[PDB]
Amino acid sequence: GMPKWRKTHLTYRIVNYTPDLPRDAVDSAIEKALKVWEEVTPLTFSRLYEGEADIMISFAVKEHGDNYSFDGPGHSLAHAYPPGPGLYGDIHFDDDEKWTEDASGTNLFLVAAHELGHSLGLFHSANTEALMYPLYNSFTELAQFRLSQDDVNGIQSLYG
Amino acid sequence: MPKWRKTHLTYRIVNYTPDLPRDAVDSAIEKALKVWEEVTPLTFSRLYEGEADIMISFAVKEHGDNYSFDGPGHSLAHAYPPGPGLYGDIHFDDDEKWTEDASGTNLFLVAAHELGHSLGLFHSANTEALMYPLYNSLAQFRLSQDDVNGIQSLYG
Numbered sequence: 001g002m003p004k005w006r007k008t009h010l011t012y013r014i015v016n017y018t019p020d021l022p023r024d025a026v027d028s029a030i031e032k033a034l035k036v037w038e039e040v041t042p043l044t045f046s047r048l049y050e051g052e053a054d055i056m057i058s059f060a061v062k063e064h065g066d067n068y069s070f071d072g073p074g075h076s077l078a079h080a081y082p083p084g085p086g087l088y089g090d091i092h093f094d095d096d097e098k099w100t101e102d103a104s105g106t107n108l109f110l111v112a113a114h115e116l117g118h119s120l121g122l123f124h125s126a127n128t129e130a131l132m133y134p135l136y137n138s139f140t141e142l143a144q145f146r147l148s149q150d151d152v153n154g155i156q157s158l159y160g
Numbered sequence: 161m162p163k164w165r166k167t168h169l170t171y172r173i174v175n176y177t178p179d180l181p182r183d184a185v186d187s188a189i190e191k192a193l194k195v196w197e198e199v200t201p202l203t204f205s206r207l208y209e210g211e212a213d214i215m216i217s218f219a220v221k222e223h224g225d226n227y228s229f230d231g232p233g234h235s236l237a238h239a240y241p242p243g244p245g246l247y248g249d250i251h252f253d254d255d256e257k258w259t260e261d262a263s264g265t266n267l268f269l270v271a272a273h274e275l276g277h278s279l280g281l282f283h284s285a286n287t288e289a290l291m292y293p294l295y296n297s298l299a300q301f302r303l304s305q306d307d308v309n310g311i312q313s314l315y316g
């Protein structure tokens with residue numbers, strides 16, 4: 001039932017893949033996600049390929065076995081649980097979205113880095129330019145990226 | 161900026177969805193009215209025959225207004241602004257799976273938001289607000305402030 005992890009070495013598993021993209025492109029995508037957050041903290045990240053990782057990452061449609069169904073194209077794009085054991089810390093992408101490498105659909109990198117926020121204990125920012133801002137933001141650019149101030153602050157007030 | 165020009169409004173649950181037991185349906189909607197009841201001087205009493213101000217019902221695809229549903233996903237329900245006739249009425253898309261929690265589409269929280277529309281509220285730019293145009297939109301629940309201000313500016 002945690003607000004933070006009590007480790008700062010976490011493990012992660014990409015449980016399955018979406019077909020909207022190559023798996024290499026999904027791993028490049030989610031490895032970047034993590035780095036954003038790695039960069040500003042002493043959290044490390046290691047990949048498992050089986051078993052329970054602290055952060056279980058997956059793609060699911062409509063109903064998917066937790067208690068909060070996804071809901072077709074649009075509406076909610078993703079959800080993730082705060083730190084804690086079992087379900088806590090997991091990431092669930094809605095595959096009724098069209099995931100892509102840029103902005104032509106729903107950018108996977110960027111929903112990924114925000115959702116990693118939730119799993120590291122971050123809640124929703126009120127600043128319009130934060131990653132953690134509830135509202136998805138296409139109008140970019142992306143090979144540009146750098147977390148807003150609010151996120152370095154929000155996240156270091158959790159792991160300094 | 162339609163308000164109902166009354167302070168007492170009747171409703172009628174014209175039909176029931178197979179998705180749920182009747183008293184989950186009634187219960188989800190009674191609750192919905194309570195959200196709104198407790199921030200207005202509006203009251204609500206139920207009709208079983210006749211024309212209520214707010215006729216609520218379930219439908220599929222094309223249904224007799226000029227606004228069909230589109231199946232599973234996309235539109236969940238619609239509801240008309242205050243006035244006579246079709247006005248004030250509320251329809252639920254029965255291509256959704258209606259649930260008393262978040263296992264499919266939560267009827268209570270769609271009711272809550274449709275009732276806003278029938279009472280004259282419009283979609284909102286805030287995300288915390290009930291009237292934000294997007295699902296999943298806690299299942300035990302507090303109206304946001306911006307919703308609270310919004311209806312109260314119509315009825316006190």
Ligand SMILES: COc1ccc(S(=O)(=O)N(CC(=O)NO)CC(C)C)cc1
Pocket residue numbers: 075076077078079080110111114115118131133134135136137287294295296297
């Ligand atoms: C970095 O872009 C994000 C912005 C919104 C979401 S969401 O539309 O799926 N959403 C919930 C939440 O912020 N997910 O983590 C808003 C929902 C209340 C409509 C997902 C990722």
Ligand SMILES: COc1ccc(S(=O)(=O)N(CC(=O)NO)CC(C)C)cc1
Pocket residue numbers: 234235236237238239269270271273274277290292293294295296297
């Ligand atoms: C919180 O409950 C709300 C009720 C219906 C939906 S809806 O997405 O199906 N929708 C239709 C209408 O506005 N009903 O309220 C808005 C969208 C199609 C613009 C969204 C949120």
Ligand SMILES: [Ca+2]
Pocket residue numbers: 053054055056084085086087088089090
């Ligand atoms: Ca976990």
Ligand SMILES: [Ca+2]
Pocket residue numbers: 070071072073074075076077094096097
């Ligand atoms: Ca969705």
Ligand SMILES: [Ca+2]
Pocket residue numbers: 018020094095096097098099
């Ligand atoms: Ca998809």
Ligand SMILES: [Ca+2]
Pocket residue numbers: 229230231232233234235236253255256
């Ligand atoms: Ca629909």
Ligand SMILES: [Ca+2]
Pocket residue numbers: 212213214215243244245246247248249
């Ligand atoms: Ca009516």
Ligand SMILES: [Ca+2]
Pocket residue numbers: 177179253254255256257258
């Ligand atoms: Ca149904």
Ligand SMILES: [Zn+2]
Pocket residue numbers: 064066068079092
């Ligand atoms: Zn989930």
Ligand SMILES: [Zn+2]
Pocket residue numbers: 114118124134
């Ligand atoms: Zn979020």
Ligand SMILES: [Zn+2]
Pocket residue numbers: 223225227238251
């Ligand atoms: Zn209709």
Ligand SMILES: [Zn+2]
Pocket residue numbers: 273277283293
């Ligand atoms: Zn609406």
